[PDB]
Amino acid sequence: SYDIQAWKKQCEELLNLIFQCEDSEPFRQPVDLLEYPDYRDIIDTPMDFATVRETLEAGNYESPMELCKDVRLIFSNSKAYTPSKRSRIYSMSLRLSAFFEEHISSVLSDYKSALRFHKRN
Numbered sequence: 001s002y003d004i005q006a007w008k009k010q011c012e013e014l015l016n017l018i019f020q021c022e023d024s025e026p027f028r029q030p031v032d033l034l035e036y037p038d039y040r041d042i043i044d045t046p047m048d049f050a051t052v053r054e055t056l057e058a059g060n061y062e063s064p065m066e067l068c069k070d071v072r073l074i075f076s077n078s079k080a081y082t083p084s085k086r087s088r089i090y091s092m093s094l095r096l097s098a099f100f101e102e103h104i105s106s107v108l109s110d111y112k113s114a115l116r117f118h119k120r121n
């Protein structure tokens, strides 16, 4: 299955599933700097799932590896900002990360396989 472009719709469908997950609710929009006034002293690069979806739809990802780096940044930002391991929003991030990693693994493998096939000769 050597379609070099297939990752994009695969990533659109996975973002749809993430938006249906109740665990995604805190990550569907950029963090509110009014409620978390110290957020940007800790977090150098804010990221959220609406920004990832807009970047994809604008044609501003070249590969699913780039999309994966931004999604992983959502989760590392949560882990760095959490005042506790036993916090609600952080705990939701860990379940959502497990779900995302379970689903992205085939998208990445198929893409890298397709690119190797394109440069086989």
Ligand SMILES: CCc1nncn1CCNC(=O)N1CCN(C(=O)c2ccc(C)s2)CC1
Pocket: 025, 026, 027, 028, 029, 030, 031, 032, 035, 036, 077, 078, 079, 081, 082, 083, 087, 088, 089, 090
């Ligand atoms: C637009 C407002 C809105 N309306 N519905 C949801 N959101 C969420 C917006 N994002 C946000 O405000 N968040 C707080 C920071 N955060 C964290 O990862 C944290 C880690 C542990 C903590 C104690 S907070 C990410 C979620």
